[PDB]
Scaffold this motif. Sequence first.
Motif, mmCIF file in Angstrom:
data_model
loop_
_atom_site.group_PDB
_atom_site.id
_atom_site.type_symbol
_atom_site.label_atom_id
_atom_site.label_comp_id
_atom_site.label_asym_id
_atom_site.label_seq_id
_atom_site.Cartn_x
_atom_site.Cartn_y
_atom_site.Cartn_z
ATOM 1 N N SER A 179 -6.749 -1.785 -11.064
ATOM 2 C CA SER A 179 -6.574 -1.427 -9.664
ATOM 3 C C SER A 179 -7.880 -1.653 -8.918
ATOM 4 O O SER A 179 -8.926 -1.127 -9.314
ATOM 5 C CB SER A 179 -6.134 0.029 -9.525
ATOM 6 O OG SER A 179 -7.231 0.906 -9.698
ATOM 7 N N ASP A 180 -7.819 -2.436 -7.845
ATOM 8 C CA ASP A 180 -8.955 -2.534 -6.944
ATOM 9 C C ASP A 180 -9.199 -1.184 -6.288
ATOM 10 O O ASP A 180 -8.258 -0.480 -5.909
ATOM 11 C CB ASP A 180 -8.705 -3.603 -5.882
ATOM 12 C CG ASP A 180 -9.965 -3.989 -5.138
ATOM 13 O OD1 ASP A 180 -11.064 -3.606 -5.592
ATOM 14 O OD2 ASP A 180 -9.859 -4.670 -4.098
ATOM 15 N N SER A 181 -10.471 -0.821 -6.148
ATOM 16 C CA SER A 181 -10.812 0.503 -5.646
ATOM 17 C C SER A 181 -10.709 0.554 -4.129
ATOM 18 O O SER A 181 -11.651 0.972 -3.449
ATOM 19 C CB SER A 181 -12.216 0.892 -6.099
ATOM 20 O OG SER A 181 -13.175 0.018 -5.536
ATOM 21 N N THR A 182 -9.568 0.127 -3.590
ATOM 22 C CA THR A 182 -9.287 0.177 -2.157
ATOM 23 C C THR A 182 -7.895 0.782 -1.956
ATOM 24 O O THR A 182 -6.883 0.087 -1.836
ATOM 25 C CB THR A 182 -9.457 -1.221 -1.513
ATOM 26 O OG1 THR A 182 -9.332 -1.131 -0.087
ATOM 27 C CG2 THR A 182 -8.510 -2.283 -2.099
ATOM 28 N N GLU B 238 0.828 -1.206 0.000
ATOM 29 C CA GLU B 238 0.000 0.000 0.000
ATOM 30 C C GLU B 238 0.862 1.256 0.000
ATOM 31 O O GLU B 238 0.614 2.196 -0.766
ATOM 32 C CB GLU B 238 -0.952 0.008 1.199
ATOM 33 C CG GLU B 238 -1.629 -1.319 1.539
ATOM 34 C CD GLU B 238 -2.487 -1.896 0.420
ATOM 35 O OE1 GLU B 238 -3.025 -3.008 0.612
ATOM 36 O OE2 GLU B 238 -2.663 -1.242 -0.630
ATOM 37 N N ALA B 239 1.892 1.285 0.849
ATOM 38 C CA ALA B 239 2.754 2.458 0.925
ATOM 39 C C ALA B 239 3.483 2.694 -0.389
ATOM 40 O O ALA B 239 3.581 3.835 -0.854
ATOM 41 C CB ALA B 239 3.752 2.303 2.072
ATOM 42 N N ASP B 240 3.994 1.628 -1.008
ATOM 43 C CA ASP B 240 4.730 1.780 -2.257
ATOM 44 C C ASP B 240 3.825 2.296 -3.368
ATOM 45 O O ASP B 240 4.201 3.208 -4.114
ATOM 46 C CB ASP B 240 5.369 0.449 -2.652
ATOM 47 C CG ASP B 240 6.494 0.618 -3.653
ATOM 48 O OD1 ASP B 240 6.728 1.759 -4.104
ATOM 49 O OD2 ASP B 240 7.149 -0.391 -3.988
ATOM 50 N N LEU B 241 2.622 1.728 -3.494
ATOM 51 C CA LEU B 241 1.725 2.182 -4.552
ATOM 52 C C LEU B 241 1.292 3.625 -4.322
ATOM 53 O O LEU B 241 1.236 4.422 -5.268
ATOM 54 C CB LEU B 241 0.517 1.247 -4.672
ATOM 55 C CG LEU B 241 -0.485 1.022 -3.535
ATOM 56 C CD1 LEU B 241 -1.556 2.105 -3.484
ATOM 57 C CD2 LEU B 241 -1.120 -0.355 -3.653
ATOM 58 N N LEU C 15 -0.544 3.902 -15.754
ATOM 59 C CA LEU C 15 0.126 3.343 -14.589
ATOM 60 C C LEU C 15 -0.475 1.977 -14.295
ATOM 61 O O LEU C 15 -1.693 1.855 -14.130
ATOM 62 C CB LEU C 15 -0.014 4.271 -13.383
ATOM 63 C CG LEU C 15 0.651 3.810 -12.090
ATOM 64 C CD1 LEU C 15 2.115 3.498 -12.330
ATOM 65 C CD2 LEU C 15 0.494 4.869 -11.016
ATOM 66 N N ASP C 16 0.374 0.958 -14.232
ATOM 67 C CA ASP C 16 -0.067 -0.419 -14.027
ATOM 68 C C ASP C 16 0.142 -0.766 -12.559
ATOM 69 O O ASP C 16 1.226 -1.178 -12.146
ATOM 70 C CB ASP C 16 0.687 -1.372 -14.947
ATOM 71 C CG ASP C 16 -0.109 -2.619 -15.272
ATOM 72 O OD1 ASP C 16 -0.736 -3.181 -14.350
ATOM 73 O OD2 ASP C 16 -0.108 -3.038 -16.449
ATOM 74 N N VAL C 17 -0.909 -0.593 -11.764
ATOM 75 C CA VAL C 17 -0.892 -0.931 -10.345
ATOM 76 C C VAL C 17 -1.808 -2.128 -10.130
ATOM 77 O O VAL C 17 -2.983 -2.105 -10.518
ATOM 78 C CB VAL C 17 -1.297 0.264 -9.466
ATOM 79 C CG1 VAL C 17 -2.656 0.805 -9.864
ATOM 80 C CG2 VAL C 17 -1.297 -0.139 -8.000
ATOM 81 N N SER C 18 -1.262 -3.181 -9.530
ATOM 82 C CA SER C 18 -1.998 -4.413 -9.292
ATOM 83 C C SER C 18 -1.183 -5.289 -8.355
ATOM 84 O O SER C 18 0.046 -5.191 -8.309
ATOM 85 C CB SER C 18 -2.286 -5.160 -10.601
ATOM 86 O OG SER C 18 -2.878 -6.422 -10.347
ATOM 87 N N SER C 19 -1.883 -6.140 -7.607
ATOM 88 C CA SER C 19 -1.213 -7.085 -6.724
ATOM 89 C C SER C 19 -0.622 -8.269 -7.476
ATOM 90 O O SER C 19 0.279 -8.931 -6.950
ATOM 91 C CB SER C 19 -2.186 -7.585 -5.655
ATOM 92 O OG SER C 19 -3.313 -8.207 -6.247
ATOM 93 N N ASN C 20 -1.102 -8.546 -8.685
ATOM 94 C CA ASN C 20 -0.653 -9.692 -9.464
ATOM 95 C C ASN C 20 0.429 -9.347 -10.481
ATOM 96 O O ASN C 20 0.936 -10.252 -11.151
ATOM 97 C CB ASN C 20 -1.842 -10.336 -10.183
ATOM 98 C CG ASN C 20 -1.799 -11.848 -10.138
ATOM 99 O OD1 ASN C 20 -1.214 -12.437 -9.230
ATOM 100 N ND2 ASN C 20 -2.416 -12.486 -11.125
ATOM 101 N N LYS C 21 0.797 -8.076 -10.615
ATOM 102 C CA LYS C 21 1.772 -7.672 -11.617
ATOM 103 C C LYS C 21 3.180 -7.700 -11.033
ATOM 104 O O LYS C 21 3.407 -7.276 -9.896
ATOM 105 C CB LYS C 21 1.438 -6.280 -12.169
ATOM 106 C CG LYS C 21 1.527 -5.124 -11.180
ATOM 107 C CD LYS C 21 2.889 -4.441 -11.226
ATOM 108 C CE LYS C 21 2.935 -3.224 -10.317
ATOM 109 N NZ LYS C 21 4.269 -2.563 -10.350
#
Lengths: 362, 557, 86, 339
Positions: free
Chosen positions: B96-99, B66-69, B233-239
């Motif tokens: 990106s999940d809306s959280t 979370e901090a990095d993103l 910007l490609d933000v995701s937990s799976n990337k």
Amino acid sequence: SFLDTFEGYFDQRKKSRHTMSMAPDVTREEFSLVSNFFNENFQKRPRQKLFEIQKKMFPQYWFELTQGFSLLFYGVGSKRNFLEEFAIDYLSPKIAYSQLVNSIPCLILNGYNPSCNYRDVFKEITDLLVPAELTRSETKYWGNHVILQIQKMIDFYKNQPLDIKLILVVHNLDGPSIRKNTFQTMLSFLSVIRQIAIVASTDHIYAPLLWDNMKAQNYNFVFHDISNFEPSTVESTFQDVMKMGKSDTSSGAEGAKYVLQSLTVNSKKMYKLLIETQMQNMGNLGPKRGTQRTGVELKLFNHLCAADFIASNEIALRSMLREFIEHKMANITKNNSGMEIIWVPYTYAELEKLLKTVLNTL
Amino acid sequence: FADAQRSHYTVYPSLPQSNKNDKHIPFVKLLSGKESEVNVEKRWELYHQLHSHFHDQVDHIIDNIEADLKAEISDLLYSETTQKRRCFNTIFLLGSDSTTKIELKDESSRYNVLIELTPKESPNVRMMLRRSMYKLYSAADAEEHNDVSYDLSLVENFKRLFGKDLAMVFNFKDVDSINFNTLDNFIILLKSAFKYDHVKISLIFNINTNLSNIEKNLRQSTIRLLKRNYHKLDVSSNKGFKYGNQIFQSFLDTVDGKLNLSDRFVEFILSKMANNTNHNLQLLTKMLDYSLMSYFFQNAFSVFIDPVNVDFLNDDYLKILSRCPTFMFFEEFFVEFLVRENPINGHAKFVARFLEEELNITNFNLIELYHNLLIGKLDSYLDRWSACKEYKDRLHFEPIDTIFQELFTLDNRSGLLTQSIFPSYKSNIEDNLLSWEQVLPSLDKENYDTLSGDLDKIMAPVLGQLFKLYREANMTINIYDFYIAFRETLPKEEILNFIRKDPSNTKLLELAETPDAFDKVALILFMQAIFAFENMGLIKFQSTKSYDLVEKCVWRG
Amino acid sequence: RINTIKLWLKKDVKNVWENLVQLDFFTEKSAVGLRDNATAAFYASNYQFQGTMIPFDLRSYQMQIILQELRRIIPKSNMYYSWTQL
Amino acid sequence: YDPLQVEEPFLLVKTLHNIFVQYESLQEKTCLFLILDGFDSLQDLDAALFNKYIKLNELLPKDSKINIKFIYTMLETSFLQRYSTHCIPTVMFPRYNVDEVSTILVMSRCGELMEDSCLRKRIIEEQITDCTDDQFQNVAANFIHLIVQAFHSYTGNDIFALNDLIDFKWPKYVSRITKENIFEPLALYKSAIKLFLSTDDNLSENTYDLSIISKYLLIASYICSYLEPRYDASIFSRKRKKKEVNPRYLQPSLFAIERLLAIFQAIFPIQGSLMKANIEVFQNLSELHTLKLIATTMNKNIDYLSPKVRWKVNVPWEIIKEISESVHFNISDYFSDIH
DNA sequence: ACAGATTTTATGTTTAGATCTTTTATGCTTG
DNA sequence: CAAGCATAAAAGATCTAAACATAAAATCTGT
């Protein structure tokens, strides 16, 4: 060629003019008598044997619950009795003992009732758990207060100690008025709270269609198979069986008829007066719902009841009407001018059927 | 009243006054209730400490994500843009999940107002604007400590009202769900706020699928306006695979050599991970935690994980473990082959660190690498990069040499792991319904005592018996013929004999003398079963004005 | 039949389509332009029309100007006058 | 007077009257023009609003020193005709010709393009110290004329879109300027020919992160939507002729959930079972629906369980096709009958 | 007992849910 | 097979009841 594959389905995908009129005539009373006789005499002993076998799994269920896993029961047969037995008799006393006195409250939510409303469910949850109120800024511009209050509850409960303060039993999670997206979203946000336990039961085959990725994550389900072929006497009560339930399945009028069949003579009489007044108002105003504009005024109803020696004053009438309000046979609101209105949310045809089938026999 | 007829009614159970000291524990005594209570308590405390140790690192990794993103998106938000104030910069957060709590940096001369909009809270353009202006006014007044109407002119008068510059950042929470007509109209409306030379706008689109849908739906003029400043910007937990590796390594360290991961278990982890991308890390954590708690639950030897309790072996423990296949193939004998820590985890960590420091390779799955190492084809996974050819000499790993790993392992051989998290829901229903013999136990000890000791065995439960014909039926079914077949499959004299078996009731025996009593009780059963099928969704009915035909919905398998 | 005409691609004809429907040459399938009063306009504003959710390619339209009138207007010397009738 | 005190047109009449009476000491008759620039561009527009502003001037005092005159501005010429019988004087503004729009772009953009910092940096870097403002004006006009002649057929006569294209293409065009190029108008056209053929106005500089199971569910949904059910068994016998009307151009048809699941099982490759529908399949389908990819046939308050809801795919042919090649599953094979 | 706190009458403003009506996508059906 | 014929269900006009909202006059509460 095949019957249980996609090829079998394609093969199967490609006449007697006899209705049920020529079939043996069925009366509701004897239908209920014979069905009841078969229910607790057909496979009693095997059912108790299976119940005792699967009861030993309860410590595993409790251990799963105490680790933040909302629990779901799926399978054929009625799990209402089984799940109620699990939650009320085993889960609550055991968790009360382990937390340490009083037992943990058990909010059991009948989902097979089409009259279940999410506003009333959250009213009960906020009456019992009593969370903090949301500030004016947190209300946002016209945003839904239920969901915002639940998110605030999540924020508050992310720091409280992880001890269960409520178990929210959800019978028939995939029922008529409980499958809609609003109440499912409420339950999805509510289940993230560790301090409450969400044990639910499903019956429909396509029930998992109701949950997205986010809702499945928030539920955090752990599916468990329970299949005991119970006849579901309680579930079938709220809907008609002579017409097979194909019509007015979600009306909820059959449950009203069942509850009003043997309730009280004076309550039945005043309900008849209210129904008749509502039909008169509908006639003064095609089958329409019994909305507020057609309902009966509280002062008018009190005067009519006093003229018929039903309820003498406001206090008795309100006390005996709270019972109907809590069971959703009637609703009380306030008009735009401030006049109180009591009304029945049933369709005019349904109201006439209710009047002519049970009310008119006195 | 009848409580079953109610809804959402609370119940306060009366707990018994009888209680003990430490009988209140979910863990049960295994081996037919022979294990002592101290073993169960030790298992409970070790499970709790290990769960806390794992979840602390999991929470640290999540907070790091979370901090990095947040830091990256905040840096990209400003990025020292020299572009003329004639367009608003746009950030498309791919998948990106809306959280997320997008934090806006505080500036002395500019307010920084984050205005968040969701599809539920945006029916149309006017409500978008009113909500945005209300949020702007509220945030500005809270920062700054008469009224103004909610319209875009509040942006026009902002410099005069509060004596400061403005920077509004629009965060569209779910840009896929909003109907793009109103979103496009709102963007065009916001375009009108560039005649003031004291307000700068920034748009953030929380796209989930791709930019292809955005290009298809949005008007061409709106895309041209957005194109002046956009940042994909490609933000995701799976990337990048750089976050699942950390959690898997945390689990590997929190089990250390104390536990072992079965090859089929990690294969199942990989398979279930490959089938979900939007929410991956949480599913992985759920799977790992469930496997761990199950292993401590239904395995009796988990009390002997640490060496200190190895001496606590009893006769029953040794007797049970004597049937271990590894022992047949091969106190003091066990410990000398138990305290030997598994070097597989250390070798895997060293290999991952070695390749991720200077080999300039990052896109790899530590779960996949661990699974491949467990199988033993590590060359087949290290040869894909075609860069460690001169480093493969020191990366060789000695084959698996371990014993007594059955008792300390994480695996799913009884099928609980797959049937408790990803069960074959419809398939399970049909398997239970077609073969009812394995669901309802068959008993004969007390059939003499029961009143129906001769009818239970011969026949089948009504619902499953009807499902048999329903599966053997056709796509469209006449109700009359279905009932006829069901009654023909129904024994005749046995039903009547069962009816005669009750002398307490009188209406039942009164109806018994009627010649078609069987023909109507069978019909009653048929209506009950067809209603149950309709409730469960197996069958459906066509136009209710005819109601003479039904259609099968679900097929077996 | 043939100087050479550049057959414009789909993504370059999309802009022409948007311009053409913006100049009120096309209309939606069954769309009412302006409501009679404020209450009806508000009701429409709260509602979500189905044609909005359908993807851009498959939105069904209707024509302001029939083909015969289009032939009547376009000059004979134009290079598309051959295809202005079936 | 508080501007928030007005809530109906009558209150506006009263407030305007109260403001105008307190200005009665003006020496001469004064008219104040209130330019409602963009009246038709209202987002809460209805037919019965403009005529309120039309008849507003009747309700104000006749002899007041200050008279308010309205000057509206609409952009539809079908909203205007609704009030064509009011006989209010109007000035219709015709659109712009290709030569007219080229001249307008030259006039309004040569100064800005000449004064670009990028061009100055390019010149000082490439060392051409013999130039006049006339040369820069000529090169800017040549670029404007080239872009207009190259994209007028695509953009029509809209000045805004041409301005956007000019702003988009100027940096590369000036980056492709060298010493002997600038003094030759055809050199830039022959060397920077890439810019002036293919337009670039899309976010992709010149697919789905879904799972494999979700991609196959989407493909199966599209196949169900765009295939006749009576041909399903014949086509999918995996264990008078086809129509050539290309149904992929028409709106997707409505199918049922059972057919979708059956064809999804039919098309899914064997791994390691036929991938029996489990929690994951249904969860992926619901996630596809909440992404507005498989739309249902009923309004809000949707219940996926009622046997009266039907599903239809909500993606065009391009997305589903490139998804098919993304997973390397043929899609112009089951549609080979319809080419 | 006097100013603050709460209530009572009286609207305005958005969201969620309802039925009527019109149109048109489904079946029924011979060769 | 299509047309005819029928019923059916999608798309939306038209509307109401409820949740959410503010406000001025009169009542109910403590010093």
